[PDB]
Each structure stands twice: as structure tokens, then as C-alpha cells.
Amino acid sequence: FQEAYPPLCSSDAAMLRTAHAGETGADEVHLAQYLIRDASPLRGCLPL
Amino acid sequence: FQEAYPPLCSSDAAMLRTAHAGETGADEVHLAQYLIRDASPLRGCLPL
Amino acid sequence: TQSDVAYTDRATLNPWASQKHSYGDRLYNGTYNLTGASPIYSPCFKFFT
Amino acid sequence: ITFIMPMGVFQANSMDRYTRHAGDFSTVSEQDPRQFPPQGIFFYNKDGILTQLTLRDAMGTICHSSLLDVEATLVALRQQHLDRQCYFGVYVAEGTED
Amino acid sequence: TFIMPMGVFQANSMDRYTRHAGDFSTVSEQDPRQFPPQGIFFYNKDGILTQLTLRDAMGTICHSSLLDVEATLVALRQQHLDRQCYFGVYVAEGTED
Amino acid sequence: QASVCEFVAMPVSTDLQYFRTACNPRGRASGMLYMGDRDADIEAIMFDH
Structure with a gap:
């Protein structure tokens, strides 16, 4: 099938950690430091 | 005869994407741009 | 010289x-046995010996 | 089916200077590109993740021929009597021996 | 395959957009929070992050042994360009002028 | 266990909707699937044009 998609990502001083554990707050851009959200296997794997 | 179908928009979609996929942008508008929307058939299929 | x-x-x-020897x-x-005479249990003794 | 479609549109009736929740597309300073016209055309194609249409083409396109147009259209409406209208002034001349 | 990008800063200036507020900038007066991205604090199995920030320069880019220019332009001496040309080209030695 | 990375120097500013559209690195078609509309010139689709 020849490809690869991008993820539910995280980790800035503005966007790194879990405090919340599930699916968190929800910004979707601000200027020029990013995060990234999911596109593949699991709408629900990674719980800490 | 005469009349018309549609879907849901946002043009500065700097009124388009923060984190949802569901029912998100509906108050028509944010600063000076043009934020079209939604009235042909299918509501809520096929997540983004 | 190697890995963590x-x-x-x-x-x-x-x-x-x-x-x-930091x-x-x-x-x-525990090998150097500096705190042998101290009767107080050291909670991080097991992490270093 | 058909539909129709768009580039940025504008309103007219001067009735919309409102506000709801805010500190806006504005910095320490005043007026670079924000009190201004929208952007345009883009899209969002097959299965979940949107697409551009900003700034590139109408030049294979209206250098076009059937617009200067005068034979057959006016032709197809020849023969009446043209509604109340006269000069306001259109004729012309050459000096005035004065 | 999933495939992970890691280097740029967009020289935008197109798509300003946003989700959060005035809750926020950093501590004092002037508002630059304009960091684009450098390399990567990342996790592992069961508690622990490690970091693909980069800090040996030291993957790929510059490399040399494309010190090697007879074969690919073995796709550049048997197909054909568009001519650029012949006063197209001048800085040299004299004519007693 | 083992792992190995394949980077190729990606882009500052025209696009984050192909950072929104996703994929294999390689980028635009070479592959194999839909065949037929002519076959034997195995030199000119990702080697000519």
C-alpha cells in the first residue's frame, strides 16, 4: 500500500504532557511552534 | 425549475481547524473574511 | 564512556x-561503608549498592 | 447536478459591527493585513485533510475572442425605436473660426 | 510506514491562526512566542522519555561521495537541453584595448 | 529491538495540508497497480517524460 500518515502528537512547553489522560484540551494552531494529531491504527491507544 | 443544495465553510478558515470533527463552527463568522456553511444532505458520517 | x-x-x-567515585x-x-555506624536506615542504599 | 461558486464575498448593508469573545488579529501595533479583505479559494479533497487554492490561474483563459462582439447579438435585436434617450451630447467638430 | 518530519521553520506568513488566549504569552512586556521546532524529547515503553533532538549533527546531510559525477549525467550526455548561449558568456584575457 | 531512519530534507513554507495529506516519503507516483495503457517502455515513468 505505499504510504504513511501523521499523528496525535504532543510536546511543547506550550504543548507537552499529560495532565489529563484520555483526549485533552484542543488548540489547533497559534503561530509557529506545533503539535500534531492522529491519522492511523488507534483512536484510543496510549493511556497513562 | 429553480433552487439550490450546500455544505459548511469558513473563509478565513483561520476560522476552520481546532480540535473537534462533529458540530464546531456555526456563528457565522470571526474577523474579516467569509465563513460559508452547510445545507445539502449528509450530516455527520465518516470522521474527518 | 558508554551508555546510559x-x-x-x-x-x-x-x-x-x-x-x-562521584x-x-x-x-x-554500601561497599565503601561510610555510613556503617549510623543506625538510621538509608532509603537509597538499595539503589547504589 | 449543478451548483454554482464564489471567491470571497462581501455583504453590503452596513449593519454588522458586533463581537462575542476576544483579543484580536492584532499585535503590539496597528494595521498590517487585518481590517482587510478575506482570502479566496482552497479546498478539502477525499478522506480527511484540507487543501489550498490561493493565487495562480486564469491565463489560458480570457484573452478570449467572443467579447469584442459586434455583429450578431445586437443584430438579433435590430428593429425598434430606442427608448427615451437623446444626445446628451455625442457629436464632434473642428475649431470654431472664432 | 508512518513518516516523521523534523526540521523547518516555515517562512510563512499566511495562516496566523489560533486556539488560546491572553491567559498567555511568557512573563513580562513584549510578545514573541514564535519558536519553530528544533529536535525531539520523546518517550519509550513504560514511564520514560528520550530525545531525538539531534545533538550529534549527525545523521545526513552534506555528505561527499557524490564525489561521483560520470554516471548520473550518464543521464546528462545523451538527451537534450534548451540552448543557452554564446555571448551569453564573457570574462577573460586581453586584446590590447 | 532494532530500528533505522530515512530522512529527506522537508519543507519550510508552501504547505501544511500534505503535513495534512500523508504518506510514504517517496512523494508522487512510481509503484505498480493500474496497468495497461502501454507497457514495455520500462524506462520513462520514474526514469523519463
């Missing part, structure tokens, strides 16, 4: 308590 086996990005988080190791490692 846990977090393989660096040698060791703090270079003050991880070398052969301050941390000279203070708590």
Missing part, C-alpha cells in the same frame, strides 16, 4: 552521583 542503559540519550542525568556514590554506596 535506561535513557539512551545521554550518559547519566546527573554526573555527580553516577560515576565510579560524591553520590562515595556517600551512599
Whole structure:
């Protein structure tokens, strides 16, 4: 099938950690430091 | 005869994407741009 | 000269308590037996010996 | 089916200077590109992740021929009597021997 | 395959957009929070992050042994360009002028 | 266990909707699937044009 998609990502001083554990707050851009959200296997794997 | 179908928009979609996929942008508008929307058939299929 | 086996990005988080004879190791490692006469249990004794 | 479609549109009736929740597309300073016209055309194609249409083409396109147009259209409406209208002034001349 | 990008800063200036507020900038007066991205604090199995920030320069880019220019332009001496040309080209030695 | 990375120097500013559309690195078609509309010139689709 020849490809690869991008993820539910995280980790800035503005966007790194879990405090919340599930699916968190929800910004979707601000200027020029990013995060990234999911596109593949699991709408629900990674719980800490 | 005469009349018309549609879907849901946002043009500065700097009124388009923060984190949802569901029912998100509906108050028509944010600063000076043009934020079209939604009235042909299918509501809520096929997540983004 | 080699790996931190846990977090393989660096040698060791703090270079003050991880070398052969660093301050941390000279203070708590049971082999040197610095705190033998102290009757107080040392909670980090098991992490260094 | 058919539909129709768009580039940025504008309103007219001067009735919309409102507000709801805010500190806006504005910085320490005043007026670079924000009190201004929208952007345009883009899209969002097959299965979940949107697409551009900003600034590139109408030039294979209206250098076009059937617009200067005068034979057959006016032709197809020849023969009446043209509604109340006279000069306001259109004729012309050459000096005035004065 | 999933495939992970890691280097740029967009020289935008197109798509300003946003989700959060005035809750926020950093501590004092002037508002630059304009960091684009450098390399990567990342996790592992069961508690622990490691970091693909980069800090040996030391993957790929510059490399040399494309010190090697007879074969690919073995796709550049048997197909054909568009001519650029012949006063197209001048800085040299004299004519007693 | 083992892992190995394949980077190729990606882009500052025209696009984050192909950072929104996703994929294999390689980028635009070579592959194999839909065949037929002529076959034997195995030199000129990702080697000519």
C-alpha cells in the first residue's frame, strides 16, 4: 500500500504532557511552534 | 425549475481547524473574511 | 564512556552521583561503608549498592 | 447536478459591527493585513485533510475572442425605436473660426 | 510506514491562526512566542522519555561521495537541453584595448 | 529491538495540508497497480517524460 500518515502528537512547553489522560484540551494552531494529531491504527491507544 | 443544495465553510478558515470533527463552527463568522456553511444532505458520517 | 542503559540519550542525568567515585556514590554506596555506624536506615542504599 | 461558486464575498448593508469573545488579529501595533479583505479559494479533497487554492490561474483563459462582439447579438435585436434617450451630447467638430 | 518530519521553520506568513488566549504569552512586556521546532524529547515503553533532538549533527546531510559525477549525467550526455548561449558568456584575457 | 531512519530534507513554507495529506516519503507516483495503457517502455515513468 505505499504510504504513511501523521499523528496525535504532543510536546511543547506550550504543548507537552499529560495532565489529563484520555483526549485533552484542543488548540489547533497559534503561530509557529506545533503539535500534531492522529491519522492511523488507534483512536484510543496510549493511556497513562 | 429553480433552487439550490450546500455544505459548511469558513473563509478565513483561520476560522476552520481546532480540535473537534462533529458540530464546531456555526456563528457565522470571526474577523474579516467569509465563513460559508452547510445545507445539502449528509450530516455527520465518516470522521474527518 | 558508554551508555546510559535506561535513557539512551545521554550518559547519566546527573554526573555527580553516577560515576565510579562521584560524591553520590562515595556517600551512599554500601561497599565503601561510610555510613556503617549510623543506625538510621538509608532509603537509597538499595539503589547504589 | 449543478451548483454554482464564489471567491470571497462581501455583504453590503452596513449593519454588522458586533463581537462575542476576544483579543484580536492584532499585535503590539496597528494595521498590517487585518481590517482587510478575506482570502479566496482552497479546498478539502477525499478522506480527511484540507487543501489550498490561493493565487495562480486564469491565463489560458480570457484573452478570449467572443467579447469584442459586434455583429450578431445586437443584430438579433435590430428593429425598434430606442427608448427615451437623446444626445446628451455625442457629436464632434473642428475649431470654431472664432 | 508512518513518516516523521523534523526540521523547518516555515517562512510563512499566511495562516496566523489560533486556539488560546491572553491567559498567555511568557512573563513580562513584549510578545514573541514564535519558536519553530528544533529536535525531539520523546518517550519509550513504560514511564520514560528520550530525545531525538539531534545533538550529534549527525545523521545526513552534506555528505561527499557524490564525489561521483560520470554516471548520473550518464543521464546528462545523451538527451537534450534548451540552448543557452554564446555571448551569453564573457570574462577573460586581453586584446590590447 | 532494532530500528533505522530515512530522512529527506522537508519543507519550510508552501504547505501544511500534505503535513495534512500523508504518506510514504517517496512523494508522487512510481509503484505498480493500474496497468495497461502501454507497457514495455520500462524506462520513462520514474526514469523519463
